[PDB]
Design a binder for this molecule. Structure first.
Ligand SMILES: *[C]C1=C([C])[C]=C2C(=[C]1)N([C][C]([O])[C]([O])[C]([O])[C]OP([O])(=O)OP([O])(=O)O[C][C]1O[C](N3[C]=NC4=C3N=[C]N=C4[N])[C]([O])[C]1[O])C1=NC(=O)[N]C(=O)C1=N2/[C]=[C]/[C]=[N+](\[C])[C][C]1[C][C][C]=[C][C]1
Ligand SMILES: *[C]C1=C([C])[C]=C2C(=[C]1)N([C][C]([O])[C]([O])[C]([O])[C]OP([O])(=O)OP([O])(=O)O[C][C]1O[C](N3[C]=NC4=C3N=[C]N=C4[N])[C]([O])[C]1[O])C1=NC(=O)[N]C(=O)C1=N2/[C]=[C]/[C]=[N+](\[C])[C][C]1[C][C][C]=[C][C]1
Lengths: 493, 497
């Protein structure tokens, strides 16, 4: 028994556990599996030395995990983006530089340009704070991303790219998801460019040694306080001190509980009293994406000799993987290529043996890169989050049509003495590790204010720009921002 | 410890507990609350005598619950449909007879006609057995019912009626739901007419005294074997006998477990080993509807004197309730009007005090019936399932866009020795009580075949027509089935010639 019990073992949890504890409070972290990273997990073994099988990239805009990571003595390193990149469409590879693949036909350049531009216009109107307050909230929330794309794109080229863009960020199908939501999501990281970018944004760097380290080291900083194998089963706010209880068959009491489960996973616990109605149902409507992350390892980074860094953007159904990044260690060390198997594909491809899938991955790469070499892997590693009981799937939680709108404002409303962290709770970079920190921190601070050691003021707190990962702003073009849409051009005539 | 553990206390479970037990097997029903009715619950108290707060109607098509009901000595009674009915639109009531409200405008008579006609054409094409197998499964599954109506309906009159038709049957918004799914649902009951009808189909009869009876009585036939207050928390197939465990802190073991939790509510349990990928994620994408059931009681059934039985179909937002049935006991006894608060409205009006809601319903009724009398309730009763931890919501589970298609075929794939009941699992009338029976029974039988006391043959079993609720088929009209759509008419117009 203690002061405050935290229900998740992952980054948001620990971040929060620590904040509290750096603050004198007596904390305890109930964590359900033997490891402690979140959807964050770092394999270590001679063949690979280390690989993030969970989440790794981290960037310019993400001032907080950067910071936390530093305090625990960790270091960044940039991802390879020196050579050229590839957009392989209709069976051929086309190389290029810069964040964005070039388009040929004017009546298409116009389209694409409108597409993204429009995503951003549409977002500039959604408070991150609270998406459900947008002038057009409902209209956008009762529509599906596919609907939007269908309405928005006069060219197939664009319709597909956008699909992919989407398949790629969040984890599912243009048809699986609320427009209002997805629109929110992108903006809440600073829009298209920031998010899609390797170099001046989202996927610039990985952490030396693994993002796993983040939470392990906080565990180290915490005493015995972090209890592994402690699936929390049952929470009771009935009396005064709160009781939490473990599948284990032990009890803990405190005067507060932060929960860092991904929202759905709340169903995993039995509450008494019952949750208020909105929450109770909300927990039931907000699932997780599906993805298998895969890493194929070669003797050296053969791509570079062909003046490709290993970034492939790949169009089409026949392809197991649509996006690929270089995963070689910072030293020229373990040549590898990283790749995601998204959404429906993640479920189709699951049935194959690991082996069967490597063949597929390779063959693809050999073809896209154009090099027999890819046919000669030297080691493979993959994780399929789909199958994880205590995670539910990967990257994040998505919102289907009906929902942000109706159940949205509940996600982080406190229930008596339970407050709620978790990346899916953030406001910046939710969905990503940074999110997961802002969350926990904001949470815990909520509890502090409750206990009276701090004002409304200091629940929400600012993000001092890191010095190691400075951020430069986003640039537009008179042309880029006044060319007509395909319709405009039509009306112009 | 025992033979087979069943996880739900509701109709599917009991139905199934029984079947097994009628068969010599050593059963046990772990149920989580003090009661035992499903999303089936019967209030009892002088003011009311009894009222189903949960699910009550039952009808011509539903050959099994009728039957079980009978074996336990229960009796049907038809619901009032002698007087006329009302379609209240744009603020006026229009009375009528027959299951279907009449429409003025031909250019609209045609539309409606096509609307429903289309729903059935569209469903003659989806094997109930396995909806995901339709020639156009995907296309229809990545579409939302709102899209379909939008695409399908050339007239507001129709778009609105249809919307309501949906808000009503399932329990969500045209935009929350998969076309493919909803289509499936309707057809899996035998289509529009069967389903919408009071008299010759869906809502013909209530049981006397309450549906609750059904499951209680089985609990009676069952020994102590039914354990209330036993939230199952944890199920372990690791070894050989399976262990299930209660929040209570006691353990049962068996050689099979039937689960009768509505699917999502699986999450409620910790599995080891972990459920296979698909199931693990499916449990998570398939929620329930939202609805508050409401019953207002009057001195006598005043509407009848006005030659209305109290069936109100009510269009518009300004309305807390869109469908209303007479609930007066079969004797002329407790004058009452039943009504549903659907979908978004369920959540909007939830904030109001019970009181605030009564004023609202009444006022509503007073205007629609046109009768100061309704301003004079003599007692009120209401349930809001939205707030129920061990149910999730009401009538049933719905599938959003992505999903029947992908995670569908798992709903009832067994996992080692866990087999899966619950209405959400049926093939007929799923979503309804009948369903829940077909499920449970079929389930159990699945286990029988496992143990080798029965062949593949007898897992799925047929449905002998009730004598007391005989069923007559669905009737079409040369005209009904050849009038053009508003498009057809358009294309017909060929001034060219
Ligand atoms: C999975 C993943 C992947 C695969 C990938 C990725 C990721 C992921 N990410 C995301 C992250 O990870 C997130 O954000 C985080 O992690 C979250 O965290 P949190 O909040 O904490 O949650 P978690 O972590 O999970 O934790 C949880 C915990 O809890 C526990 N439990 C449960 N239940 C329970 C418990 N206990 C007791 N009782 C009970 N019941 C569990 O177990 C745990 O422990 C990401 N992120 C970042 O940042 N980075 C990266 O990299 C990532 N990744 C990704 C991304 C992708 N991208 C970027 C791509 C792209 C491209 C182009 C465009 C766009 C995008
Ligand atoms: C709710 C409802 C309402 C409100 C209404 C209705 C309904 C309902 N219904 C439906 C029914 O209810 C269903 O189907 C059934 O009941 C189901 O059952 P099952 O299968 O078994 O499931 P349940 O019952 O829920 O059971 C469950 C059990 O389990 C338990 N738990 C949980 N969790 C747990 C447990 N244990 C251990 N552990 C754990 N974890 C619980 O508690 C329980 O016990 C219906 N149906 C019929 O048949 N009828 C009727 O009436 C109904 N209702 C309605 C309907 C409506 N309508 C028809 C209307 C319309 C109009 C026009 C057109 C169409 C429609």
């Amino acid at each position: 028994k203690c002061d405050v019990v935290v229900v998740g073992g992952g980054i948001s949890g620990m971040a929060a556990a620590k904040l509290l504890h750096d603050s004198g409070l007596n904390v305890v972290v109930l964590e359900a599996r033997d490891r402690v990273g979140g959807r964050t997990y770092t394999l270590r073994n001679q063949k690979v030395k280390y690989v993030d099988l969970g989440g790794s990239y981290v960037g310019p805009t993400q001032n907080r995990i950067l910071r936390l990571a530093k305090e625990l003595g960790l270091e960044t390193y940039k991802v390879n983006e020196v050579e050229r990149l590839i957009h392989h469409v209709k069976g051929k590879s086309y190389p290029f530089r810069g964040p964005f693949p070039p388009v040929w036909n004017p009546i298409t350049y116009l389209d694409h340009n409108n597409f993204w531009r429009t995503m951003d216009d549409m977002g500039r109107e959604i408070p991150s704070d609270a998406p459900w307050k947008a002038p057009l909230a409902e209209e956008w929330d009762n529509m599906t991303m596919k609907e939007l794309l269908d309405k928005l794109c006069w060219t197939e080229s664009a319709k597909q790219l956008a699909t992919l863009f989407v398949n790629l960020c969040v984890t599912a199908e243009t048809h699986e998801v609320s427009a209002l939501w997805f629109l929110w999501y992108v903006k809440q990281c600073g829009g298209t460019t920031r998010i899609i970018s390797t170099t001046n944004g989202g996927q610039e760097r990985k952490f030396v040694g693994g993002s796993g380290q983040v939470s392990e080291r906080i565990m180290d900083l915490l005493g015995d306080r972090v209890k592994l194998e402690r699936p929390v089963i049952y929470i009771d706010q009935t009396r005064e001190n709160v009781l939490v209880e473990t599948l284990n068959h032990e009890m803990y009491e405190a005067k507060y509980v932060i929960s860092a489960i991904p929202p759905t996973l709340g169903m995993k616990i039995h509450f008494n009293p019952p949750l208020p109605m909105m929450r109770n149902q909300m927990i039931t409507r907000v699932p997780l994406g599906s993805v298998i992350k895969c890493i194929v390892y070669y003797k050296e980074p053969f791509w570079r000799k062909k003046d490709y860094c290993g970034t492939m953007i790949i169009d089409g159904e026949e392809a197991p993987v649509a996006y690929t990044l270089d995963d070689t260690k910072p030293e020229g060390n373990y040549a590898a290529i990283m790749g995601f198997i998204l959404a429906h594909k993640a479920r189709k491809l699951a049935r194959l043996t690991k082996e069967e899938r490597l063949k597929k991955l390779c063959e693809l790469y050999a073809k896209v890169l154009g090099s027999l070499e890819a046919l000669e892997p030297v080691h493979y590693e993959e994780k399929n989050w789909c199958e994880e009981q205590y995670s539910g799937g990967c990257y994040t939680t998505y919102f289907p049509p009906g929902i942000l709108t109706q159940y949205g404002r509940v996600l982080r409303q406190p229930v008596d003495r339970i407050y709620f962290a978790g990346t899916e709770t953030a406001t910046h970079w939710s969905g990503y590790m940074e999110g997961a920190v802002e969350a926990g921190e904001r949470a815990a601070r909520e509890i502090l204010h409750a206990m009276g050691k701090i004002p409304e003021d200091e629940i929400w707190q600012s993000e001092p720009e890191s010095v190691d990962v400075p951020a430069q702003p986003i640039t537009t073009t008179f042309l880029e921002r006044h060319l007509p849409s395909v319709p405009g051009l039509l009306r112009l005539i």
